[PDB]
């Protein structure tokens, strides 16, 4: 995140941090979608050119954290992973199409003031809210404590004209126009974290996107690009249906 603001305590209680155990390293953002399930980007877990192909025992998650380096006693929780699930049509060889993965936790995480799941979008929320100019929210670490930025969704032809990457219907883009000069951006380093929207219909928060790549911030590009969660919900449901508890 760049040009964001400090997240208030319990502002983003679905926030999940994905770590490599050894050497201990923060790899990516992620989000809590139920007491046993965490959503992230596939490229955080599987990218063979960079020798990235994690097994469940290589990783952990920390949940309920707002400080990047400081232990938060009786607040933050650690969970091990039972299984990793990568979209079967994830396209790492071209454009990161279907950049989505699920991680099943070994044990249910207890909910608290600081830990609570975000909603998956339904047909109404996807149809109504994923529109150019509407803003969602991305949370992550600065490029320290959790940072927040609110970003407008970009018109689809504008998104396509702003990158050489082939933009599929499983992707959307967001961020402020460069020449406009309103500040705040999501970055490559925010990969895997959630793009959320607060529904005006029922006042609940929905995860509409996953940060898939960022072209701005520390690069000369314009926008951040997101996996379209609703577009891939059939897969999400197939995995949770068969392997949930």
């Amino acid at each position: 995140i760049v040009e964001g603001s400090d997240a208030e305590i319990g502002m983003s209680p679905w926030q999940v941090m994905l770590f490599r155990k050894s050497p201990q390293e923060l790899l990516c953002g992620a989000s809590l979608i139920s007491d046993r399930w965490v959503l992230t980007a596939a490229h955080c877990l599987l990218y063979p050119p960079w020798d990235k192909n994690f097994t469940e025992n290589d990783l952990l998650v920390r949940i309920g954290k707002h400080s990047r380096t400081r232990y938060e006693r009786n607040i933050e929780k650690i969970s091990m992973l039972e299984k990793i699930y990568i979209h079967p049509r994830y396209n790492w060889r071209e454009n990161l199409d279907r950049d989505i993965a699920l991680m099943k936790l070994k044990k249910p995480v207890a909910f608290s003031d600081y830990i609570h799941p975000v909603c998956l979008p339904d047909r109404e929320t996807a149809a109504s809210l994923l529109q150019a100019g509407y803003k969602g929210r991305v949370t992550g670490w600065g490029n320290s404590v959790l940072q927040v930025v609110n970003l407008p969704i970009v018109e689809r032809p504008v998104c396509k004209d702003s990158t050489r990457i082939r933009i599929t219907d499983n992707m959307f883009c967001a961020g402020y126009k460069p020449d406009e000069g309103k500040r705040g951006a999501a970055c490559e380093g925010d990969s895997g974290g959630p793009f959320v929207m607060k529904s005006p219909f029922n006042n609940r928060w929905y995860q509409m996107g996953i940060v898939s790549w960022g072209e701005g911030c520390d690069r000369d590009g314009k926008y951040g690009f997101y996996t379209h969660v609703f577009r891939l919900k059939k897969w999400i449901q197939k995995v949770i249906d068969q392997f949930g508890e």
């Binding site: 139920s34 249910p108 609570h116 005006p200 609940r204 928060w205």
Partner: peptide, 30 residues
């Protein structure tokens, strides 16, 4: 498993409190 109560924050919606910037999101719908 928590799906029924998803997306409602204990320190915000549950308490009838709003965070500092959620009004910006609401305004973007206008």
């Amino acid at each position: 498993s928590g799906e029924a109560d998803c997306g409602l924050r204990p320190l915000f919606e549950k308490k009838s409190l709003e965070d500092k910037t959620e009004r910006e999101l609401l305004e973007s719908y206008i």
